[PDB]
Amino acid sequence: RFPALLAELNDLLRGELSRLGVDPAHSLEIVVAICKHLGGGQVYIPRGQALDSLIRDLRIWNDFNGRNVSELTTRYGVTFNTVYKAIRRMRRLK
DNA sequence: TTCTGTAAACAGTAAAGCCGGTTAATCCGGCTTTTTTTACGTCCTCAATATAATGGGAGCTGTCACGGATGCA
Structure with a gap:
């Protein structure tokens, strides 16, 4: 469940960065950052x-x-x- | 050289904060009878008459014939 959801999340982050003027590749840092600060267990995102x-x-x-x-x-x-x-x-x- | 476990990690069951509608509950203004009270016109009730008045039958009923009492004379 993790790979496709992470890929789509990164796609949307880089799309939003491109829309806002930021470089899309910076989204990787973002997701990496959140992947460090949002872990701990299993819980659905709403x-x-x-x-x-x-x-x-x-x-x-x-x-x-x-x-x-x-x-x-x-x-x-x-x-x-x-x-x-x-x-x-x-x-x-x- | 061959046969065992174990930590990262993905399904599951349970419960409640909230929650997008669910229901009951009270209060301001208003119309419609509902009943009540007069106004009054109508309806109901009674009294009096001062020339004089002094006794019906009202249509009878139109007719059969038994019996059985019945009460007198």
């Missing part, structure tokens, strides 16, 4: 699901300024309970 919901609520209350909460339920289709919890959360943070 995303920031907590951060995904965090930025979702961020966008929700950035678009929210009143009645457009209904538009929020029309934006993607979500509950008013989570929207109200997110509003209270944005009130909590300063």
Whole structure:
């Protein structure tokens, strides 16, 4: 499982470096670096699901300024309970 | 020279934080009866009449013929 996934990861890293102006071969260093600092065991790579919901609520209350909460339920289709919890959360943070 | 293990490493089982929807729960404004109270017109109830008035039958019923009582005279 490791070889093909590592190869694709290196391909994407070098593509992103080329897009950003960095030399693609520098990606090897990057992956080597992460291969030193990310080991320890077996765990699947996902995303920031907590951060995904965090930025979702961020966008929700950035678009929210009143009645457009209904538009929020029309934006993607979500509950008013989570929207109200997110509003209270944005009130909590300063 | 031939037959054994062992550490790097990839499948597995279990559990819970979160989570993208799941349900119940209360509060502001409004229409619709639901009942109630007057207004009133209508409906219901009663009283009085001062010339004089003084006894029906109302259509009978149109007809058969047994028996068995029945109560008198």
